């Protein structure tokens, strides 16, 4: 149902464009989807939840949340309290 020259034939019997859609075969065979898990969000980044997750980033002493102690389970480690130098020079 796309086109017809006879302003019929698609009806005649049972005929429409070539086979039943369109061509035969162009409706199957991949998908996005979550079947059995209806909660998973948008791609899981497991090794980059650095935009995402409470983990990773001062939330320690100096963030705006009470919570104290390492950040959640010590992905981080330091390196936004005080460290060393850096590229200040003369």
């Given at each position: 149902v796309?086109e017809?020259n006879?302003?019929a034939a698609?009806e005649?019997?049972?005929?429409r464009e070539?086979?039943h859609?369109?061509?035969?075969?162009?409706?199957e065979?991949?998908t996005t989807?979550d079947?059995?898990?209806?909660?998973?969000?948008?791609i899981?980044?497991?090794?980059?939840?650095?935009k995402?997750?409470?983990?990773?980033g001062d939330?320690i002493?100096?963030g705006d949340?009470d919570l104290?102690?390492?950040?959640?389970?010590?992905?981080?480690?330091?390196?936004?309290?005080s460290?060393?130098?850096?590229?200040?020079?003369i």
């Amino acid at each position: 149902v796309n086109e017809a020259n006879c302003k019929a034939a698609m009806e005649i019997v049972c005929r429409r464009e070539f086979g039943h859609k369109e061509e035969e075969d162009a409706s199957e065979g991949v998908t996005t989807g979550d079947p059995d898990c209806p909660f998973t969000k948008a791609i899981p980044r497991e090794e980059y939840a650095n935009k995402y997750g409470p983990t990773i980033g001062d939330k320690i002493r100096l963030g705006d949340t009470d919570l104290i102690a390492e950040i959640e389970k010590d992905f981080a480690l330091y390196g936004d309290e005080s460290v060393f130098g850096g590229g200040k020079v003369i």
